[PDB]
Design a protein around this ligand. Structure first.
Ligand SMILES: NC(=O)c1ccc[n+]([C@@H]2O[C@H](COP(=O)([O-])OP(=O)(O)OC[C@H]3O[C@@H](n4cnc5c(N)ncnc54)[C@H](OP(=O)(O)O)[C@@H]3O)[C@@H](O)[C@H]2O)c1
Length: 307
């Protein structure tokens, strides 16, 4: 239906600039994990060519099922898809990185991943107890996975500006991407600017912020009926969700909208027949509260906590 354009990464690889999210943080009680397989299929059918997943989501198998069905039914070939997955926090020793990737690949039914990310800069033991492995060591394992051909590109997630600078100064290849939370109430303007200045593209997770339900009360504005958002939706004949995603696109970001609904999946990639003005982007930036949807504060005292 709609194929998203690409950003060309610092290693030459091209990445589609909308990714389907497959994290399960928003999944309701009535939502079984097979809906991820169906969502992946529907997304590809609707023109998506980029899927974001992670070992820790425990749904790589479903993602792989959806990919396999899309390929078998002739929607796409493997080389037309861009699959992103992530190394979990208990696999940070250098020698664990390649085997962890091979495990992800087996679950996904793939021979290579397009993008492998360090999920967080924190290292833990398998029981979530803190460890102190330097993410520079983990990055050497990432460099190895790339040299072996198992990952076409390598990047990071949840790295702050100091960590990005240290990683860049102390490695031979810098990340292609930093995947971080970006939405109207957590706009991360300085970190985005820092990454972009270094040629590191940004993937924006939890792109809908608190405009969608997070199973909490006391969420910060804007609501879905916020007058600024609904005026924008009306102006461009788009939904509020599309406005929120286009905002991220106009900041040069790769949003990762999660949906398991056929219609919303299709809406969430239909972002390329309009654009926001600089004043509109500035207005949305004014909602910033540095209030994260993804709260990892139980890890605040861990080595390399990024927030
Ligand atoms: N540490 C990390 O690197 C990290 C952290 C968080 C997330 N992520 C990634 O980023 C993805 C997105 O973040 P997220 O899972 O927090 O969710 P999100 O994409 O911010 O929000 C998803 C929610 O919005 C709803 N929705 C989707 N499209 C909509 C639309 N057009 N209009 C109204 N509602 C809409 C969804 O419902 P329906 O499903 O019913 O449509 C769901 O409840 C994750 O799935 C994951 O891939 C990565």
């Amino acid at each position: 239906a709609v194929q998203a354009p690409c950003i060309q990464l610092n290693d030459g690889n091209t990445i589609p600039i909308v990714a389907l999210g497959t994290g399960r943080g928003t999944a309701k009680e009535s939502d079984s994990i097979d809906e991820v397989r169906q969502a992946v299929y529907w997304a590809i059918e609707a023109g998506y060519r980029h899927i974001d997943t992670a070992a820790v989501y425990q749904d790589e198998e479903q993602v792989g099922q959806g990919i396999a069905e899309a390929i078998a039914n002739g929607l796409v070939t493997r080389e037309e898809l861009f699959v992103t997955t992530k190394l979990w926090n208990d696999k940070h020793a250098r020698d664990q990185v390649v085997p962890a990737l091979q495990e992800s690949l087996k679950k996904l039914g793939l021979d290579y991943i397009d993008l492998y990310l360090i999920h967080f800069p924190i290292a833990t033991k398998p029981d979530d107890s803190p460890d102190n492995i330097d993410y520079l060591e983990t990055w050497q394992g990432m460099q190895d996975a790339r040299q072996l051909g198992l990952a076409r590109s390598i990047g990071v997630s949840n790295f702050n500006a100091t960590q990005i600078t240290r990683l860049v100064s102390n490695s031979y290849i810098r990340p292609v991407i930093n995947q971080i939370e970006v939405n109207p109430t957590n706009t991360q303007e300085p970190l985005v600017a820092h990454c972009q200045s270094l040629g590191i593209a940004v993937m924006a997770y939890s792109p809908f912020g608190f405009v969608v339900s997070r199973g909490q009360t006391g969420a910060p504005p804007p609501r879905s009926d916020d007058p600024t958002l609904t005026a924008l939706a009306n102006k461009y004949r788009k939904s509020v969700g599309q406005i929120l995603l286009r905002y991220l696109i106009d900041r040069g970001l790769i949003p990762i909208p999660k949906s398991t609904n056929k219609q919303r999946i299709a809406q969430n990639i239909d972002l390329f027949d309009f654009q926001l003005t600089f004043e509109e982007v500035a207005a949305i930036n004014q909602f910033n509260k540095n209030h994260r949807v993804i709260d990892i504060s139980d890890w605040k005292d861990y080595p390399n906590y990024p927030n």
